[PDB]
Amino acid sequence: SKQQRIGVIGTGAIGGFYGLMLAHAGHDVHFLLRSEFEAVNRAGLSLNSAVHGFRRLAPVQAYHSAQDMPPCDWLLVGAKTTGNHELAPLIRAAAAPGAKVLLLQNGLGVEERLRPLLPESLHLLGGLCFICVHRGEPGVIEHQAYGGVNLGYHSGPADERRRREIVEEGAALFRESGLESTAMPDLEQARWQKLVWNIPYNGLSVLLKSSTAPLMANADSRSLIEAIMEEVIGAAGACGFILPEGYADQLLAATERMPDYRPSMYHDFAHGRPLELAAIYAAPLARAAAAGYRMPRVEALHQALRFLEAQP
Amino acid sequence: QRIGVIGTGAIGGFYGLMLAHAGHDVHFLLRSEFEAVNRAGLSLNSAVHGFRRLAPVQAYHSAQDMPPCDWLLVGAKTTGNHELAPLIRAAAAPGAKVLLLQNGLGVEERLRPLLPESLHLLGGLCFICVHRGEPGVIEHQAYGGVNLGYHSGPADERRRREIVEEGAALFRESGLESTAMPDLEQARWQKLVWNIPYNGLSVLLKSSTAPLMANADSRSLIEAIMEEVIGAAGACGFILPEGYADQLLAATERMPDYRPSMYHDFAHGRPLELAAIYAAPLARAAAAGYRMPRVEALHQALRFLEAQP
């Protein structure tokens, strides 16, 4: 696989991790820093990883304005979905002709909401990241577990054969970098699948002010998580996407194996950053409502999270 | 007739004081370390009924020292009812009326095997904002009405109605709103529509009634929980009044900012009344094949919180 020039738009824990891992695989990686450019450019990018050991990118090819970035073959959007409405000018400024835009973002309907502002010549893909990672000290990325990326194609100028090829190119990029990666045939199905984990765990970790270990240890919280998982699974099927056998117990088991992890929404709440409620809760609730399918627990959890955000 | 207060907490303190202030003969069993407020007396700070002081107060350290009482108000938390059964028994006169001024569902039935069948066992559903803020003092913020109902005992139907009416007359003649209810279990379901959303969410959301009402999302959640409780009541054979949610939401709207009993319990490390207010209604609804997903989830969260450090 030829050297790719890779642009990272929004370099939080997610964009920093994948951008660093690709850079270490020998790719030419360029980082757009919205919030922390001055800090990271002189500090550099460091990775504490229980999986890959310590790694460092210094000097980093860091940028504060998308216009200074070179034209990139792949644009990795690790920023949160909360700022996806000002993303398009940044993507367009940093994209080589025919560039691949890969949204490393959770929730539902993300790609459809960004496509209106992206030129038709750009491929738009989604990447569902099953990873335990967060921002540690400034310029530091704390990676506790996993890292796999499930890629799917949303829209763009490729026909069906070329779509599969492009999704497989992106997966091979991550795999070459020592990361797990899977080409998904159906991005929307894959987004519903990731919701079965993000919806209970992100929200309950904020609401119950707890991490994954106490949440799985307590029997009542664990029964609640399963019940919420069955609402998402039921909503997916009602909307046309029927998810695999015993998918709940599979993520129950993977999270059981998981080290004590604070989901990204927990960290967001602790630091005053707006929660990704629109993409993770509001959108699947709206879809299920269109299908006439009630999600009482998820709806109640969403009302609780909105309440908490509004409290001083 | 002669009245005894078994567990003179905020509930028992308020109703015993109001009855005694109205000229009834009331005997207070001080079960906590609060019988050092023996000679200081009992005082009430009520936004409704004003400042009242009871001096001196007939207090007793133990139940056998108490005289036989014709009425026994039990206003303590439901979790400690079995430990109170001997005290009720010791203080009861022949054929005394035991009035559980307690919330939840199934409360009387769980106590009935521990009481002589010669006692009348009643339930009093108290819509009231009250707490024990400072020693020997009762802080009354709002409301205070008692819906009384008959549960078990050696009374026929006519005697049942007369005893429920006599109990309601006791509170009315003290200046309180009181209503004789023909069905105690239905009246218990009516009170659950308030206690289930507000008690639980006050702990879960670390809030009180005013901000829970001021925010549209928690207001929507409370109403959805209320409709679950109303729905469960009908499934079990109890039709609640039409527009009951709006009536409760309107009363709480006008209510001053209030931390429910369960909030104070959680904050001070006391065990939460989860059995009678959540577990019992969920089990009844389950027996009637009716699911309460929000209440079930709310109950699971509350249990998680209690188990947490």
Tokens of A5: 């020039």
* Cα A205 from Cα A195, distance rounded (Å): 15
Q: Secondary structure of chain B: what % helix, strand, coil (to 5)?
A: 50, 20, 30
Q: In this complex, which of A218, A297, A310 lies closest to B297 when CB atoms are compared? A: A297
User: In b/e form, how buried is each residue of B228-240, taking b as 16+ CB within 10 angstroms?
Assistant: bbbebbebbebeb
The residues, ordered by sequence, that sit 6+ positions from A168 with a Cβ below 8 Å of its Cβ are A183
Look up residue B29 and give its amino acid.
Answer: L
User: In b/e form, how buried is each residue of A8-24, taking b as 16+ CB within 10 angstroms?
Assistant: bbbbbbbbbbbbbbbbb
* Cα B118 from Cα B159, distance rounded (Å): 13
Which of A109, A111, A149 shows the shortest CA–CA distance to A280? A109
Task: List Cα–Cα distances, A275 to A121, A282, B136, in angstroms.
Answer: 32, 12, 46
Tokens of A196: 């079965």
Task: List Cα–Cα distances, B3 to A5, B36, B73, B74, in angstroms.
Answer: 86, 21, 8, 11
* Cα B84 from Cα B121, distance rounded (Å): 14
* Cα A21 from Cα B125, distance rounded (Å): 64
| A159 half-sphere exposure, CB direction, 13 A CA radius | 1
* Cα B80 from Cα A263, distance rounded (Å): 39
Diameter of chain B measured on Cα atoms: 54
* Cα B21 from Cα B37, distance rounded (Å): 18
Domain B2-182: CATH superfamily is NAD(P)-binding Rossmann-like Domain (3.40.50.720)
Backbone angles phi, psi at B40, to 5 degrees: -70, -35
Which of A109, A111, A103, A45 shows the shortest CA–CA distance to A76? A103
The verdict on a CB contact (< 8 Å) between A220 and B294 is: no
* Cα B7 from Cα B80, distance rounded (Å): 10
Q: Which CATH class is domain A189-310?
A: mainly alpha
Q: Which residue in the block uniquely carries the two structure tokens 């602790």?
A: A270
Task: List Cα–Cα distances, A9 to A18, A67, A84, in angstroms.
Answer: 11, 12, 11
Q: Which CATH class is domain A5-185?
A: alpha beta
The residues, ordered by sequence, that sit 6+ positions from B64 with a Cβ below 8 Å of its Cβ are B90
Q: Is the dihedral of CA B217, B219, B222, B224 positive or negative?
A: negative
The residues, ordered by sequence, that sit 6+ positions from A123 with a Cβ below 8 Å of its Cβ are A98, A99, A100, A101, A153, A155, A156, A157, A158, A166
Backbone angles phi, psi at B116, to 5 degrees: -60, 145
Q: In this complex, which of B211, B217, B303 lies closest to A303 when CB atoms are compared? A: B217
DSSP state at residue A243: -
Please provide the DSSP assignment of B136-154 as one string.
Answer: TEEEEEEEEEEEEEEEESS
User: In b/e form, how buried is each residue of B177-195, taking b as 16+ CB within 10 angstroms?
Assistant: ebebbeebbbbbbbbbbbb
* Cα B2 from Cα B68, distance rounded (Å): 8
* Cα A288 from Cα B131, distance rounded (Å): 44
| A242 half-sphere exposure, CB direction, 13 A CA radius | 1
* Cα A33 from Cα A44, distance rounded (Å): 12
Q: What angle do the packed helices B280-287 and B293-307 form, to 10 degrees?
A: 150
Do B240 and B270 form a contact (C-beta atoms < 8 A)?
Answer: no
The residues, ordered by sequence, that sit 6+ positions from A238 with a Cβ below 8 Å of its Cβ are A288, A291, A292, A293
* Cα B181 from Cα B64, distance rounded (Å): 32
* Cα B307 from Cα B309, distance rounded (Å): 7
Q: What is the residue extent of each domain of chain A?
A: 5-185, 189-310
Which of B54, B247, B259 shows the shortest CA–CA distance to B141? B259
Do A105 and A126 form a contact (C-beta atoms < 8 A)?
Answer: yes
Strand partners, B74: B6, B100
* Cα A243 from Cα B113, distance rounded (Å): 51
Strand partners, B121: B98, B152
Which of B217, B199, B207 shows the shortest CA–CA distance to A307? B217
Strand partners, B3: B26, B71
* Cα A59 from Cα A38, distance rounded (Å): 13
Q: Report strand pairing: B178-180 vs B137-152.
A: parallel
Q: Which helix (H) or strand (E) holds B274?
A: helix B274-274
The verdict on a CB contact (< 8 Å) between A311 and B211 is: yes
Tokens of B184: 């105690």
Per the rule left: phi > 0, alpha: psi between -120 and 50, beta: everything else, A195 is alpha
Task: List Cα–Cα distances, B186 to A263, B227, B229, in angstroms.
Answer: 44, 15, 12
Do A268 and A166 form a contact (C-beta atoms < 8 A)?
Answer: no
Which of A254, A235, A246 shows the shortest CA–CA distance to A293? A235
Do A125 and A76 form a contact (C-beta atoms < 8 A)?
Answer: no
Q: Which residue in the block uniquely carries the two structure tokens 């664990």?
A: A222
Do A147 and A51 form a contact (C-beta atoms < 8 A)?
Answer: yes
Tokens of B255: 């209510």
Please, what is the end-to-end C-alpha distance for chain A in angstroms?
51
* Cα B143 from Cα B151, distance rounded (Å): 24
Q: How far does CA A214 lie from the centroid of its chain?
A: 24
Do A137 and A111 form a contact (C-beta atoms < 8 A)?
Answer: no
| B50 half-sphere exposure, CB direction, 13 A CA radius | 4
Residue A2 annotated among the catalytic residues of the structure:
no
* Cα B272 from Cα B262, distance rounded (Å): 6
* Cα A168 from Cα A174, distance rounded (Å): 10
* Cα A6 from Cα A11, distance rounded (Å): 13
Do A199 and A235 form a contact (C-beta atoms < 8 A)?
Answer: no
Angle at the Cα of B146 (from B78 to B247), degrees rounded to 5? 105
Which of A68, A74, A22 shows the shortest CA–CA distance to A41? A68
Q: In this complex, which of B220, B293, B308 lies closest to A214 when CB atoms are compared? A: B308
Torsion of CA B110, B113, B119, B125, to 10 degrees: 0
Task: List Cα–Cα distances, B113 to A14, A266, B160, B276, in angstroms.
Answer: 61, 48, 19, 17
Interface contact B309, partner A, CB < 8 A: no
For chains A and B, CB pairs below 8 A equal: 71
Interface contact B306, partner A, CB < 8 A: no
Q: Report strand pairing: A181-183 vs B2-6.
A: unpaired
Q: Which residue in the block uniquely carries the two structure tokens 């009348």?
A: B120
Mutate to test the interface with A, among B196, B202, B206, B217 (most CBs of A within 10 A): B217
The verdict on a CB contact (< 8 Å) between A220 and B297 is: no
How many other CB atoms sit within 10 Å of the CB of residue B139?
A: 17
Which of B75, B104, B82, B285 shows the shortest CA–CA distance to B185? B104
Which of B134, B124, B130, B131 shows the shortest CA–CA distance to B142? B130
The verdict on a CB contact (< 8 Å) between B220 and A304 is: no
The verdict on a CB contact (< 8 Å) between A227 and B293 is: yes
Mutate to test the interface with A, among B205, B206, B304, B305 (most CBs of A within 10 A): B304
* Cα A306 from Cα A296, distance rounded (Å): 15
Please provide the DSSP assignment of A5-27 as one string.
Answer: EEEEES-SHHHHHHHHHHHHTT-
Domain B186-307: CATH superfamily is N-(1-d-carboxylethyl)-l-norvaline Dehydrogenase; domain 2 (1.10.1040.10)
The three-state (H, E, C) secondary structure of A143-212, written as one string: EEEEEEEEEEEEECCCCHHHHHHHHHHHHHHHHHCCCCEEECCCHHHHHHHHHHHHHHHHHHHHHCCCCH
Tokens of A285: 């609730």
Do A229 and A172 form a contact (C-beta atoms < 8 A)?
Answer: no
The residues, ordered by sequence, that sit 6+ positions from A122 with a Cβ below 8 Å of its Cβ are A91, A92, A95, A98, A99, A100, A101, A156
Which residues from chain A sit within 8 angstroms of residue B207, using beta carbons? Answer: 307, 311
